[PDB]
Amino acid sequence: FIPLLKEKPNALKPLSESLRLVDDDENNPSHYPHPYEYEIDHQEYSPEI
Numbered sequence: 001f002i003p004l005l006k007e008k009p010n011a012l013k014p015l016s017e018s019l020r021l022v023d024d025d026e027n028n029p030s031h032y033p034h035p036y037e038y039e040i041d042h043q044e045y046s047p048e049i
Contacts, residue, residue: 001032002032003015003019003032003034003035005035006035008035008036008039010039011035011036011038011039012038012039012041012042012043013036013037013038013039015035015036018033018034018035018036018037018038019032019033019035020032020033021033
C-alpha cells in the first residue's frame with residue numbers, strides 16, 4: 001500500500017521521512033509505516049479534554 005494522505009497537519013513529523021521503510025528484521029519483512037505516527041508518539045494531550 002502506497003501512503004495516500006499527503007497532509008500531515010498538527011503533526012510532530014513531516015510526511016516525508018514518515019513515508020520511508022523500517023529495516024527488515026527478525027519479526028518483520030519489508031513494509032511501509034505511517035505519516036502521522038510521531039504526532040501519536042508522545043503528544044501531551046488536551047487538558048480541557
